[PDB]
């Protein structure tokens, strides 16, 4: 199906002494493949998937150089933004950046994005056409004018449609054995009783990849949303994901309820019953 490469960057200022904390992570789909942490000893971009280790010393030198350049822009940005918003030196502040590209099932460019936030709020983002900017406020509007004169959007559009897509395809090929594998969820149902009137049914999906999944309950063949609880999809820690959905039902009526699971690793949706 479709694929993505996405980079996530966070810098957090440290008022009293020294530069900000900088953390950078890179993903292909739901697999992290690289990291840089400004607090780590190596001061290098580090591998986090075995298929990226195929890449040579030039890759590591070049990714390290760029990620440190990312870090220094963020450092400059924290001071600039403190100035824009008339803030003091005492408080800690955050900048977050996400960019990347989506490709479809044919592995051709679908979508590119580049967005940026200050203290957890939209600051500025590249629009879908990759030719213009969305500035949330007047500070961001000053940045937009700066970036328009400097033709920033044009440089980003070339990367997002070019290099980004090219290297995603490359990573997808080198990591084929895992990145192009789907892991279907392992499903089961649990039952608990609160009193002698009331039962909880829990439908589990475990060990699945990619993260995207739909779990729903039906009652007598119709969708049931009331008296249900659906948890956030969560990492197992081994690269796979977990989720569950529970429904509260009257004891003895368990049979009316079916759990339905949709995932790309399943050719048709699966049904579970107690």
């Amino acid at each position: 199906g479709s694929h993505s490469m996405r980079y996530f960057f966070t810098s957090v200022s440290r008022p009293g002494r020294g530069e900000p904390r900088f953390i950078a992570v890179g993903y292909v789909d739901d697999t992290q493949f690289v990291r840089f942490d400004s607090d780590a000893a190596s001061q290098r971009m580090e591998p986090r998937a075995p298929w990226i280790e195929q890449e040579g010393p030039e890759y590591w030198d070049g990714e390290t150089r760029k990620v440190k350049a990312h870090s220094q822009t963020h450092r400059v940005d924290l001071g600039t933004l403190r100035g824009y918003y008339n803030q003091s030196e005492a408080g800690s502040h955050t900048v977050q950046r996400m960019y990347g590209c989506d490709v479809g099932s044919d592995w051709r460019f679908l979508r590119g994005y580049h967005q940026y936030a200050y203290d957890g709020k939209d600051y500025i983002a590249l629009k879908e056409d990759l030719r213009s900017w969305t500035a949330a406020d007047m500070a961001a509007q000053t940045t937009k004018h700066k970036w328009e004169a400097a033709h920033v959007a044009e440089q980003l559009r070339a990367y997002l449609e070019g290099t980004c897509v090219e290297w995603l395809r490359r990573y997808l090929e080198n990591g084929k054995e895992t990145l192009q594998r789907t892991d279907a969820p392992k499903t089961h149902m649990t039952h608990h009783a609160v009193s002698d009137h009331e039962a909880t049914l829990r439908c589990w999906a475990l060990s699945f990849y990619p993260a995207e999944i739909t779990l729903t309950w039906q009652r007598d063949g119709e969708d049931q949303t009331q008296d249900t609880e659906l948890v956030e999809t969560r990492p197992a820690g081994d690269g796979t994901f977990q989720k569950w959905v529970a429904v509260v039902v009257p004891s003895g009526q368990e049979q009316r309820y079916t759990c339905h699971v949709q995932h790309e690793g399943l050719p048709k949706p699966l049904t579970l019953r107690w």
Partner: peptide, 9 residues
């Protein structure tokens, strides 16, 4: 592969 350049705000 990271973007070659990152403009300041």
């Amino acid at each position: 592969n990271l973007v070659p350049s990152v403009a300041t705000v």
